[PDB]
């Protein structure tokens, strides 16, 4: 109805998602990080192939232009790829280890933007990583390795930016403000030593969620809502009403076309502006769904409830 299938009876355990689309062509091509490694996902008319272009366990991955970053390998480090590279090595290194992110255990991405980015930061013992995208080369530079009070297990991990900051502070938490209007971010810039002690909830009740989708609104997934907020946390003013309570239990959120798509094990939902409608819905039982990636493209895993054993199918929105 709304979910196009992308791979029948994908025999890989995904991790991450990111697209890619080959220069003077139309079609972007998935990639995605397994632990069987990396793939490109190919579709020569109404046949679609998963072919292998890096072997490294692979659980996080991200492109931009024709560069892919990963983190790989048994011991985890952040990688660099060129993908031309990795796609000249299988037709019938190219691939960098990137210094001082050895044991890397998490990266998430700001999309600058008016700070000169992107921006990768990683996470790594008792310190994090800021790499800063670099054009002239087409590579991400590290540009700063500050010490980091990182919590055990990381929960949230992400970037935010305000307008005005020169460069994306670091979000390793979240947590209630004004009942139903506002949210306490969690977030030290870089350099400084900060923690949040008392009332640290031991992961709030289930899943939580930090994802900025514009230069100053925040998606926040927290205690059965979604919030939409200011980087500082306040309730983004115009329009009105800033909340969606979730009917399901969900899982994960993504904003793509304006629209708020939430997913949960037998479903995806998608809910309109600021707060109002709720379009379109999928329900079934009998597949257990599954976020892979968001928000360009999203992609989704179905599997039969309850075989985890079972290959999966792979759609997009």
Known sequence: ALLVKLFNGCPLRIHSTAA????????????????????????????????????????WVYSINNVLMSLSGKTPHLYSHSILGLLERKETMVSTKIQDTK???????????????????????????????YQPMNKFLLVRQVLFPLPTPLSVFALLTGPGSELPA?????????????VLFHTVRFGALSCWLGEMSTEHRGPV???????????????????????????????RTPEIPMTEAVE??????????????HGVQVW????????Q??????????????????????????????????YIQ
Do not use: Y
């Not at 999309?111 to 990683?122: D, I, K, R, Y």
């Not at 670091?170 to 506002?182: A, D, M, N, W």
């Open 20 to 59: 890619w689309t080959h220069p003077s062509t139309k079609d972007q091509h998935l990639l995605l990080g397994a632990e069987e490694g990396i793939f490109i996902l190919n579709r020569n008319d109404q046949e679609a192939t998963l072919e292998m272009l890096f072997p490294s366990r692979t659980t």
């Open 103 to 133: 044991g890397c255990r998490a990266c998430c991405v700001a999309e600058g933007a008016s700070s000169g980015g992107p921006f990768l930061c990683g996470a790594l013992e008792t310190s994090v990583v800021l790499l800063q995208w």
């Open 170 to 182: 670091v979000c390793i938490g979240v947590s209630p403000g004004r009942p139903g209007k506002s």
């Open 209 to 239: 969620q930090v994802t900025q989708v514009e230069e100053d609104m925040v998606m926040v997934l927290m205690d059965g809502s979604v919030k939409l907020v200011t980087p500082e946390g306040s309730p983004v003013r115009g329009l």
């Open 252 to 265: 994960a959120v993504a904003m793509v076309g304006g629209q708020l798509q939430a997913f949960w094990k």
């Open 272 to 279: 309109a502006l600021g707060s109002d409608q709720l379009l």
């Open 281 to 314: 819905e999928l329900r079934d039982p009998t597949l257990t769904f599954r976020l892979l990636g968001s928000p360009r493209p999203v992609v989704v895993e179905t599997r039969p409830v309850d075989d985890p054993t079972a290959p999966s199918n792979l």
